[PDB]
Amino acid sequence: PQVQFKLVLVGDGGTGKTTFVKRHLTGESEKKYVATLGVEVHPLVFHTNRGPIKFNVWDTAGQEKFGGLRDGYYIQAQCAIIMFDVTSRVTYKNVPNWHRDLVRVCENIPIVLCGNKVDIKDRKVKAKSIVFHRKKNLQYYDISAKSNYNFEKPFLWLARKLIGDPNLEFVAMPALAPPEVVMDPALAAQYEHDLEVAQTT
C-alpha cells in the first residue's frame, strides 16, 4: 500500500532513455518485463520529506525506432518524460510528435522535457533553440544519463506537481550507478547559465 505513479519515458530511439532509467540501481534490480507490450517497468523509489514516492517508469524495448507506440503503453500514465539528444537536431524536431501522441491518450498529465547527452562537448541543440516547453506548460532540464547529471530533477519537479506541494524535497539522492563519464563542472555551469538567460528572453 504505497504511493506510486506510472511514468512513461518516450522519445526517439537512441536518445538515451534506457541508459537514463537504468542509473537507478534498485529500479534496475527490481524491474518487471511486460511481455504483451514489450516494456520494462522500473520501480524507482525516491525518499521525500513527506515519505517515499515510487515512479514506475515504462521503458520501451526499442519499438519507437520503427513506428508509434501502442495505446496500452500510454494507458493510465500519470506523468511523462520526453527525451531528445542534444547532439541530434532531428530528435528535438520530433519532440512535438511525441507530445501529441502523449496528450491524445493521457491529456494534460505533467510532462518534463529532457535534453540528454550534454556531457558531449560538440553540442548541436543549445539553450537558445529549446523553446517547445515554454509553449506547452512543460519543465525542461539538461541531463547526462552517463554522468548522472541532473538525474533527480525531472522526478522532483514531477513529484511536486503530482502531490501539489512546491516545498517537497528529496532527503537523499537514490543509489545510482557510478558515472561512466565526467560532467565538466564549468560546462554544466555555462549550460545552466545559458538556460537562465533564455528563460528571460
Binding site: 500500500p1 504505497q2 504511493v3 506510486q4 506510472k6 518487471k32 511486460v34 511481455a35 504483451t36 507490450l37 516494456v39 517497468v41 520501480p43 521525500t48 520529506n49 513527506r50 515519505g51 514516492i53 514506475n56 515504462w58 496500452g72 503503453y73 494507458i75 493510465q76 502531490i163 506541494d165
Partner: protein
Amino acid sequence: GSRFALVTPKKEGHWDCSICLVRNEPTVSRCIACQNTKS
C-alpha cells in the same frame, strides 16, 4: 513533514497488476494497460 505524511492509497477491490503495476478498478478482471488477467 510528519504531520503531512503522504496518504496511503485506500483501495477496496482495486488491484495492482502484478505484471505492469497499473492500478485497476474492482469491476475489471483484466488489466486495461497490458491486458493480462488479474494475478
